[PDB]
Design a protein around this ligand. Structure first.
Ligand SMILES: O=c1[nH]c(=O)c2nn[nH]c2[nH]1
Ligand SMILES: O=c1[nH]c(=O)c2nn[nH]c2[nH]1
Ligand SMILES: O=c1[nH]c(=O)c2nn[nH]c2[nH]1
Ligand SMILES: O=c1[nH]c(=O)c2nn[nH]c2[nH]1
Ligand code: NA
Ligand code: NA
Ligand code: NA
Ligand code: NA
Lengths: 295, 295, 295, 295
């Protein structure tokens, strides 16, 4: 037997950082969960009990904190690139670093219509994420995403004209509820290294905001023919607005809300045009994915 | 042996309701999870296998949907009171109904600065809840709450002057992070029945809003001496603003964020006045509770 | 306003302890999650920012570890009683301690048919719990429980003869699936203090084992008329076998498995006597409770 | 823009099946959660709102139930292969089916030392899983796994001789706790189609049992030099015992248990040889992966 692939590191490293403006007194907080996995010439730790090639996972944890102390942690694409580059430059035998960062929301509170200098609310479970793969001699590959964005529209969704055979019971519909949790990923063109990532820093926050805005506006405004058709419209728009993106991937569950026939009870009408009360279904759920790239 | 207490019913009943304004085209959605447990002369179902006294839990589920079809589901204090009263009036041998409702957030989307007629976002995991106990001959007892409101302030929290003995290692501090998940409950004066609950309908939403506003403003503005002192200030204010409330209860975890000493690494300064990077602690956590009533 | 009730302490304190037999080389592990909440003359910490009355929650955490170092942690009824008594004896102004312990399963591995001296498996998510309330001048109240015991029987469950009215759609049945997660609590007679708890130490593990054995055998063997009737049989037996128990409480969800009518597809028969494939329902669920005491 | 990749289907389909032996009266239950995602000539559903190419996700759900009614659901490798093959054969334009199955434990109860004919316990949260990819013209690729197997050993784990630099604080150790949740995957050689999968049916359960047995015995008996070294030993053995396996992958968290220094309290000794009470750490955790194949 032989080691075909190996990686190891530290997962679930929670990090908080505060920035304090001495002039204005305003404080800004960042909170993330970080995972770093390393690859390189480490097979002998597996096959020969040779620990000399192991950068201890505990040391990786220390490094994340030190790096956060000495560098900006925003945008996460930059922080991830700095963190990954550190490992491949510092250790001769480490040739790839894989950094995943989940950013948690701490939104500044408005108290009596004015922004508070040091108080924050977790205003959503929505996350902003990055995956950064730093590979020696091959540059920096970055996938940015948003996830956990939960939305619902109560009308202006349709689903008709699908395949019908002996396995089909679903009725065609011209008016249904559509609800989903959005997971959207945009993949950046490969960067040559840190200098290039730094050159594009302003684009990271702007592209996240664009992806979010396009997702929300398209969801709200599209008279949806299917989840498939609506998600494609979202992806097309994002690719149009940022040329440094190579692909956009969406993964959308279809979180079903079922009509409840109450006609058995005093002829109560609660279906079709009369539907007011519905049963949200926890499971099963449709799951629709697509990756959109350039012609 | 004897049955000392018994209750039974249906839990985890998910309900969605839509209101459609025909004039304006605006739609409004409500989503809840409902639990109803009944008590009464039902001991023989336990001791003698006498199912004749059992209103089937499946029938309770049907009743929740029917009641939602035929009545307002907002404010939840009203819906809960209607639902509970139904069971005690309809069934001679059922003498108490216990209704718990969790309301989920579906906040209207703003698209290009204007409110969208039929699109919504789950803008937080914060819940608004009610517990309604409807007891035959004893009226309606209602406890309203908010829960899952997660906040953090990065300064203006202190904790010093606590008891010090041979079990104490905690250092006194004049500047720390304070973060919590707020669970706040206000207990209404007993109502005589549905007519009285209906008479006070406008007070329910207003009191929820007040409790939320007081919680946020007090958290943000108090230079906190302890979680204990800050939460008391919140409760005092709520009781002052709504005379129909008898008690306010808060249950607050103290979600710790620890300093990280980095001095071992090149004399890096990251404690006290120099603290920028912290380690959020998943567990353990302080847990502070208090119930405040009138003199 | 006035403080009507207050308690505070540390929750989610994870503790592991190992016992090493020097003679045999056998090791035994215990893992628990502990919560301790205190009450006493502490109102001024809330109303006056008087921290002098506060035993810091951090100190409570330290105390749990120290107490685990210096005492047996099994049975948990004993450990909880020791821990609670410590706080009321040590601090003049603390008058009640509320200790909750969740015990996690670490079951010794069998390797090649023999018990391994130091390797363990989490063989179930089932917990053994205690709630110990130690109140100055009022002794020690202990509630022992098991929870998270998930079982299913595929036949020998019935449900017929329930109330039928205009809210009822449920069909009577003489053969259904019954599945539940068992939560069973037995309440001990009040103990005068630690000496008395110590006097009964052997009864704690024995009564837990009896409660578990009775629950499993009754579930498996009863041709169940309802969840209500089966759970009463369990409680009756436990009370018969341990005279120091005052009450037994069961809380059982009815985790529904629905028939799937497949007759629309080539006349496939999958209902009644022909039912083979079912749809487990995540929600809603029945919830049945009862507290059984002595005549 | 163009569709680069697309797949869609139904996730979280819960399925239960019962087998009833008419001769012996013994019943056997199976419970699974199934996901099926399809690929093929479906791009126009995304780009042109052409639903004619969509096999509705609801129909996929129906198909899972029908297929479970008409076929064995064990071993899951077989059921998954049948289910996947159905979609590629039935629909001309569907060219790949991706089937994921999670099998839940329902272990027959022993009552008074004898196996009960129709009562079961969820004796662990451990799962047995399969991923089956059925691709038209390319056969059937099967990855079998176990996951959620949680183990702990209290001694006979070491970790010393790792890299030490200015980022390192971890002390070398010759005696520590090792605890992990095992995720182990074995990848079968490609099968040409259903006939070949059927030919190997007995090997599936046997290989699962072997993988489990090897994992447990190796964990218990290895005087572990590192997680890396121990996991390699496991993988090597599995590959030796089943020639139809091409690779074995392990993913193991290192769930840390920290010593607690209590020396500040009355010189209490609880470190090194005196360590009895430890603090289990919820996060962060080491994460160690490896894929082992043949020379
Ligand atoms: O077994 C281990 N492997 C590692 O890579 C490691 N790093 N810290 N502790 C460790 N333990
Ligand atoms: O055992 C049961 N008890 C009940 O109260 C009930 N209601 N519906 N099905 C039921 N099953
Ligand atoms: O606000 C606090 N209250 C307390 O009781 C406490 N104990 N430790 N830290 C604390 N912080
Ligand atoms: O938008 C949808 N897409 C689908 O593929 C589907 N299948 N059932 N309902 C559906 N809705
Ligand atoms: Na390198
Ligand atoms: Na009544
Ligand atoms: Na006392
Ligand atoms: Na095909």
């Amino acid at each position: 037997s032989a080691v075909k692939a190996a990686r190891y590191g530290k997962d679930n490293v929670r990090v908080y950082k505060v920035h304090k403006d001495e002039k204005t007194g305003v404080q800004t907080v960042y909170e993330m969960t970080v995972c770093v996995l390393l690859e390189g010439e480490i097979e002998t730790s597996y096959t020969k009990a040779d620990n000399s090639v192991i950068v201890a996972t505990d040391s990786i944890k220390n490094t994340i904190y030190i790096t956060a102390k000495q560098n900006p942690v925003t945008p996460p694409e930059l922080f991830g690139s700095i963190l990954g580059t550190h490992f491949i430059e510092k250790y001769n035998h480490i040739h790839a670093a894989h950094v995943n960062i989940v950013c948690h929301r701490w939104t500044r509170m408005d108290i009596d219509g004015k922004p508070h200098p040091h108080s924050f609310i977790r205003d959503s479970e929505e996350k902003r994420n990055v995956q950064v793969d730093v590979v020696e001699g091959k540059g920096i590959d970055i996938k940015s995403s948003l996830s956990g964005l939960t939305v619902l529209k109560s009308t202006n969704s349709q689903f008709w004209g699908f395949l019908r055979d002996e396995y089909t019971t679903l009725k065609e519909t011209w008016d249904r509820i559509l609800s989903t949790d959005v997971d959207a990923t945009w993949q950046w063109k490969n960067f040559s290294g840190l200098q290039e990532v730094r050159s594009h820093v302003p684009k990271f926050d702007a592209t996240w905001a664009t992806a979010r805005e396009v997702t929300l506006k398209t969801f709200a405004e599209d008279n949806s023919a299917s989840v498939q058709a609506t998600m494609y419209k979202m992806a097309e728009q994002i690719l149009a607005r940022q040329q440094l993106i190579e692909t956009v991937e969406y993964s959308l569950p279809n979180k079903h809300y079922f009509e409840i026939d109450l006609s058995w009870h005093k002829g109560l009408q609660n279906t079709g045009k009369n539907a007011e009360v519905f049963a949200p279904q926890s499971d099963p759920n449709g799951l629709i994915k697509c990756t959109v790239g350039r012609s």
